[PDB]
Amino acid sequence: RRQPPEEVDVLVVGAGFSGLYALYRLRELGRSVHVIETAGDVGGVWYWNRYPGARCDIESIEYCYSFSEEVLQEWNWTERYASQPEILRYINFVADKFDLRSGITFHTTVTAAAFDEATNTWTVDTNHGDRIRARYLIMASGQLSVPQLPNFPGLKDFAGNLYHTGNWPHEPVDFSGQRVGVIGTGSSGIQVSPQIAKQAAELFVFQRTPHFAVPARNAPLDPEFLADLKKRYAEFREESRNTPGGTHRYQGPKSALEVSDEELVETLERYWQEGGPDILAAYRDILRDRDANERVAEFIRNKIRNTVRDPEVAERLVPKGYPFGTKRLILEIDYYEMFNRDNVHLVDTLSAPIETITPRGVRTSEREYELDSLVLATGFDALTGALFKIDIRGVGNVALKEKWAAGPRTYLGLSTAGFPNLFFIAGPGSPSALSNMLVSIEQHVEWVTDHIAYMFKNGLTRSEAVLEKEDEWVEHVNEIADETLYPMTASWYTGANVPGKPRVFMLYVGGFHRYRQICDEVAAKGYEGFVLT
């Protein structure tokens, strides 16, 4: 409805945390800037994922913007870990406060973008037949998207109520009196299930791969504490910027292998009772050493066995075969405890795979389960999923999809050679999903918008990563990743390992603070590694 400009200094794709701050900062810097967003309003993942139990896995006081002193002073977080409704209210507050929606076109999807060498501009097309000419294109298009896979066979035949965690109804769903099925036990499944368990007459959880999850220990945020923090919030967030992960997480000095079974249990139990993801850094080698990881993994496995009364059910819930904590750690709220309710039933689909969804419910090899409601608790596509849905064409009409088929090739994760004037916020090649994303998003938006400002200040119009420096960066990312357990997780690679072909690990794992220092050095040296004309 709001018409996008025909010409703009910067076009931003996406109106979540990334796109909104890019918009705001480019305005402040005196540039012309517009946003295109698929959704009807702001929020990004916090707009589109609205299933009950959706909640951030790092603390509220950390997972927030810091760019505005007034925002910091005026917003009251109510809980240790904020719910999606609260996060969405916060994002709407920011957009409201700074009149940001005047700079956004909603209900509109960018379908293609092509670089034009003559003018040093991007021409961008949308699914409403808009054409925009921007000098710079910022992809604030996110890291998590709906997977592009067919649904289970027979899904369209289900005769009951069907829900998707990825597109949950806007009005509340009452499961009272119902036999409900939940398919999927990743992040969405683990968060949504205990909420459904509160209402359903019966609940069947269809679990394929068991995932690691630790207790949130969520609690109301003491108003007195928050008021005290607000007096020194700038000092606090500068402390967060100077860490590997972008939060105040204690860095455990010891090796998980150097302690007695006794000290390990004592230490890991303290983390279990405190709750949250800080357990990931209980010891220094959890993500470096195969045996160090398995030791922490085993303790968690035993917590599952301890919590779930039925030992057969408990054993099916235990993650096996793969390392702990190589992805964002899921916080659970009575997910394990849930299985002790008489009305909750675990269906192990590794043992009995789903044959088909039926009109009555779900059929495995063993039996049919009759259900009144079925919830699909879907996972997420590769980090590159959003980008790959757009036909992006660079120098020589090369498709970004083709160049990145063996993995995302970038310099600092910020730009790729052959695709001038194009920038990625919080994406492959940078700390991204392996950090407090609000800290990474702010660093990236500041770096990219500062760079765009510098260009205009010096009368330049074309910014391209130097190919040698991209190759060095890619290799450097691989080298440091190969020193960790992260490569053990298939989702951090695009496609399988093929002899005699390159393979690029998705993310920088060397620590946010170290990455920040690199980026600052690059900027200080006049953008060393970019060719600017």
d(CA 528, CA 533): 13
Q: How far is the CB of 13 from ligand FAD (least distance, A)?
A: 5
Q: Which residues pair with 272 in a beta bridge?
A: none
| Of the residues 4, 10, 17, 423, which one makes contact with ligand FAD according to CB under 6 A | 17
Kindly write out the interface string for residues 90-109 of this chain, putting x where it contacts ligand FAD by CB under 6 A and - elsewhere: -------------------x
Q: Which residues contact 468 (CB under 8 A, 6 or more apart)?
A: none
Take residue 265 and report the two structure tokens written for it: 């249990």
Q: Give least dist CB 153 to ligand FAD, A.
A: 27
Contact between 278 and ligand FAD by CB under 6 A: the answer reads no
Identify whether the C-beta of residue 52 lies closer than 8 Å to the C-beta of residue 170.
no
Closest CB to ligand FAD among residues 264, 390: 390
Neighbouring CB atoms inside 10 A of 284's CB total 16
Q: Are 377 and 147 in contact (CB under 8 A)?
A: no
Among 83, 121, 141, 185, contact with ligand FAD (rule: CB under 6 A): 141
Which residue number has the CB closest to ligand FAD? 44
- Give the interface segment with ligand FAD, choosing from 139-147, 233-241, 310-318, 515-523 (CB under 6 A): 139-147
Q: 256 by DSSP, 3-state: which?
A: coil
- Contact indicator for 380, 177 with CB cutoff of 8 Å: no
Task: In whole angstroms, give the CA distance from residue 233 to residue 229.
Answer: 6
Strands (E), 17-140: 33-36, 104-105, 110-116, 121-126, 131-139
How many positions of this chain bind ligand FAD (CB under 6 A)? 36
Q: Which ranges in 218-372 belong to alpha helices (H)?
A: 223-230, 233-241, 261-274, 290-307, 311-317, 335-338
Q: Does 22 bind ligand FAD (CB under 6 A)?
A: no
Which H or E run includes 386?
helix 385-388
> What DSSP string runs through 122-142?
EEEEETT--EEEEEEEEE---
Query: Can you tell me whether residue 207 is helix, strand or coil?
Result: strand
Q: What is the distance, to the nearest Å, from the Cα of residue 524 to the centroid of all Cα atoms in its chain? A: 30
Of the pair 45, 95, the CB lying nearest ligand FAD is at: 45
Binding mask 380-399 for ligand FAD (x = CB under 6 A): ------x--xx---------
Rounded least distance, CB 326 to ligand FAD, Å: 15
Restricting to residues 451-470, which ones interact with ligand FAD according to CB under 6 A?
none
**Beta carbon of residue 17, minimum distance to ligand FAD (angstroms, whole number):** 4
Minimum distance between the CB of residue 310 and ligand FAD, rounded to whole angstroms?
Answer: 28
Residue 340: what residue type? N
Nearer to ligand FAD, 369 or 388 (CB): 388
Give the residue with the Cβ less far from ligand FAD, 148 or 306. Answer: 148
CA nearest 175: which of 62, 71, 51, 89? 51
Q: According to CB under 6 A, which one of 9, 10, 11, 19 is a site residue for ligand FAD?
A: 19
Binding flag, residue 110, ligand FAD (CB under 6 A): yes
Q: Is 245 in the site for ligand FAD (CB under 6 A)?
A: no
- Per CB under 6 A, the segment of 201-209, 304-312, 434-442, 496-504 that binds ligand FAD is 434-442
Strand positions, DSSP E, 108-218:
110-116, 121-126, 131-139, 161-164, 179-183, 202-207, 213-215
Shortest CB 414 distance to ligand FAD, Å: 14
Type of residue numbered 228: D
Minimum Å gap between C-beta 273 and ligand FAD is 20
Say whether residue 292 binds ligand FAD (CB under 6 A).
no
Is residue 58 at the binding interface for ligand FAD, with CB under 6 A as the rule? yes
Which residues lie near ligand FAD (CB under 6 A)? 13-19, 36-39, 44-45, 49, 54, 56-58, 63, 109-110, 140-144, 187, 328, 386, 389-390, 425-426, 436-437, 441
